[PDB]
Amino acid sequence: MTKWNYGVFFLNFYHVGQQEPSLTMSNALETLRIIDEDTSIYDVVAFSEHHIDKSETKLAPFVSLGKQIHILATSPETVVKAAKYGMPLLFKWDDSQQKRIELLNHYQAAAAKFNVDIAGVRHRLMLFVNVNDNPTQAKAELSIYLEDYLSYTQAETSIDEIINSNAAGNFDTCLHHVAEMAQGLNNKVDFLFCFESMKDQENKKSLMINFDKRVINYRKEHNLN
Amino acid sequence: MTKWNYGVFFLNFYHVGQQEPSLTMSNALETLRIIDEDTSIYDVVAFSEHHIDKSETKLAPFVSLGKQIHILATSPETVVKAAKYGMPLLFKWDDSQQKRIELLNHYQAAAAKFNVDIAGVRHRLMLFVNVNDNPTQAKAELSIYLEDYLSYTQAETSIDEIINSNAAGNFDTCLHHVAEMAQGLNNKVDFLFCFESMKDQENKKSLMINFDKRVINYRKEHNLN
């Protein structure tokens, strides 16, 4: 079997959740502290900043995760290019799951044609994660968090789809849904989670630690280290 | 004494050196291969893409190097903000060395005021590196490489300054100049090198390997591991 890797991302947008940018900033810095001090599984950090270019002269939509260069899966066109060079993809949190699957299949078809071996290649899937004992409250909090971003990207009507393709609900449902989406992507995805839509910093911390512990135990149980 | 760290960056711009983007791409992929297969010191990879925003809604000019978040040193204003949060800087290759020094000093002054300890903090300095037995040829190659980028950023007249604040010349002069610029920045900088202005892929490889070997030997000689 295969070890799944987990990392964290932050949405690089100044207006989220009706928060002052200074609060959004201190919240993000606590996430970083939790990564540094309280946990071990969160291997890499990235920033979601594709709302800018979308809003051309780039060599490619490159995203560096450590020293492994991914291509952000921005279009069928873009993933064909990534496959030509055998590079792993980064799937957008703001794409529907069906769309990500479509892009994965475009990619694997392109690699075959170009005789590019992609056997070992593992992609990364960006997901927002909001855990609440009341699932409606989790989805509500994520919706409110994303309001200004979606207004800026002119994608307000895609909010329900975004909610459905990310992880918002109680803890067990979120984990199950994460596993379902991985399964949909042929279990070829590692993850980047964004926890910032959880206002309650103690809840965020508890989540990040609980998940850290679950992953450590899983890896021990299955001898993945 | 302190271990200096080295990484690599690529300029995310489609028109360099009058090269077809496919060639620029295959050149970059060979650099990645050299990092992966022929050397060990190149710890992280980043992309220079600040020609875009410059050409606002970001929470900050964040750059992730692994899981260590840097702030791109885009203005005195921006570095004061980085110091408030005690975060390390990424110095621009396209800034003059005097400018980088000014920004370093702005930063250290801000941290003192805010009682933020920055003792352990190490920044990163982006530099183009072009080594040629004929120093004029190295500077010439770098100039031609950057022509279209500088036209796009409307900074054509800054080319001489850029040459002077990066490493272009014979191998020993480049290394000495890198050391001088570090010294100017109080020896508080690790590095990201961009090797892509060297057209000759064999010369690039030889350089990357020779430098790798020099750093390994240095670390052994001084017990830095």
Domain boundaries, chain A: 1-225
Determination method here?
Answer: X-ray
Instruction: Tell me which of B57, B81, B90 to substitute to probe the interface with A (most A C-beta atoms closer than 10 Å).
Output: B57
Pick the residue from chain B with its C-alpha nearest to A148.
Answer: B57
Distance from the A52 Cα atom to the nearest Cα atom in chain B, whole angstroms: 8
Question: Which residues does A23 contact at the CB level (< 8 Å), separation at least 6?
Answer: none
For residue B86, give Cα distances in angstroms to B82, B116, B119: 6, 6, 10
In terms of Cα–Cα distance, which of A134, A129, A86 is closest to A108? A86
In terms of Cα–Cα distance, which of A130, A102, A128, A106 is closest to A118? A106
SS3 letters across A75-112: CHHHHHHHHHCCCCEEECCCCCHHHHHHHHHHHHHHHH
Nearest to B59 among A25, A45, A152 (CB): A25
Question: Which residues does B20 contact at the CB level (< 8 Å), separation at least 6?
Answer: none
Nearest to A45 among B35, B45, B69 (CB): B69
Tokens of B98: 């005097």
In terms of Cα–Cα distance, which of A53, A46, A57 is closest to A91? A46
Element (H or E) spanning B24, and its range? helix B21-37
Provide the pairing of β-strand A6-11 with A42-48: parallel
Owner of token pair 């990534």: A82
Angle at B59 between CA B57 and CA B60, to 5 degrees: 105
Pick the residue from chain A with its C-alpha nearest to B56.
Answer: A14
In terms of Cα–Cα distance, which of B98, B93, B124 is closest to B13? B93
Beta bridge partners of B6: B42, B191
**Chain B environment of A59 (Cβ under 8 Å):** 10-14, 21, 24-25, 28
**Chain A environment of B47 (Cβ under 8 Å):** 62, 64
Q: What 8-state DSSP symbol labels residue A195?
A: -
In terms of Cα–Cα distance, which of A104, A119, A127 is closest to A186? A104
Contact A60, B25 (CB under 8 A): yes
Resolution for this model in angstroms, one decimal place? Answer: 1.9
Contact A81, B37 (CB under 8 A): no
Q: B-side interface with A, Cβ within 8 Å? A: 7-8, 10-15, 21, 24-25, 28-29, 32, 35, 42-47, 49, 51-53, 57-60, 62, 64, 66-67, 69, 85, 152
A&B contacts, CB < 8 Å? 89
How far is Cα A31 from Cα A37, in angstroms, rounded to an integer? 10
**Chain B environment of A7 (Cβ under 8 Å):** 67
Longest dimension (CA), chain B: 50
How far is Cα B58 from Cα B46, in angstroms, rounded to an integer? 18
Contact B125, B100 (CB under 8 A): yes
How far is Cα B100 from Cα B92, in angstroms, rounded to an integer? 8
How far is Cα B214 from Cα B219, in angstroms, rounded to an integer? 9
Nearest to A52 among B12, B53, B59 (CB): B53
A 10 A CB-CB count for B59 gives 19
For residue B10, give Cα distances in angstroms to A112, B29, B47, B63, B197: 28, 10, 5, 13, 10
CB–CB of A32 and B59 under 8 A? no
Owner of token pair 């459905």: A164
CB–CB of A64 and B58 under 8 A? no
Give the CATH architecture of domain A1-225: Alpha-Beta Barrel (3.20)
Distance from the A16 Cα atom to the nearest Cα atom in chain B, whole angstroms: 10
Q: Is the dihedral of CA A13, A16, A20, A24 positive or negative?
A: negative
Beta bridge partners of B181: none
- Which amino acid is located at A209 in the chain? I
**Chain A environment of B28 (Cβ under 8 Å):** 59
Query: For the CA atoms of A137, A140, A141, A142, what is the dihedral angle to 10 degrees?
Result: 130
For residue A211, give Cα distances in angstroms to A3, A112, A191, B33: 15, 36, 13, 34
Taken as a whole, chain B contains a residue count of 225
Pick the residue from chain A with its C-alpha nearest to B43.
Answer: A67
For residue B201, give Cα distances in angstroms to B26, B136, B212: 10, 19, 16
Note the helical H segments in B114-185: 135-152, 159-164, 171-184
- In 3-state terms, chain A is what percent helix, strand and coil (to 5)? 50, 20, 30
In terms of Cα–Cα distance, which of B177, B194, B189, B167 is closest to B17? B194
Instruction: Tell me which of A67, A148, A150 to substitute to probe the interface with B (most B C-beta atoms closer than 10 Å).
Output: A67
How far is Cα A88 from Cα A85, in angstroms, rounded to an integer? 9
**Chain B environment of A24 (Cβ under 8 Å):** 59
Owner of token pair 């030889």: B206
Owner of token pair 């927002």: A128
Tokens of A225: 């280290």
In terms of Cα–Cα distance, which of B69, B75, B70, B68 is closest to B53? B75
**Cα distance between the two ends of chain A:** 12
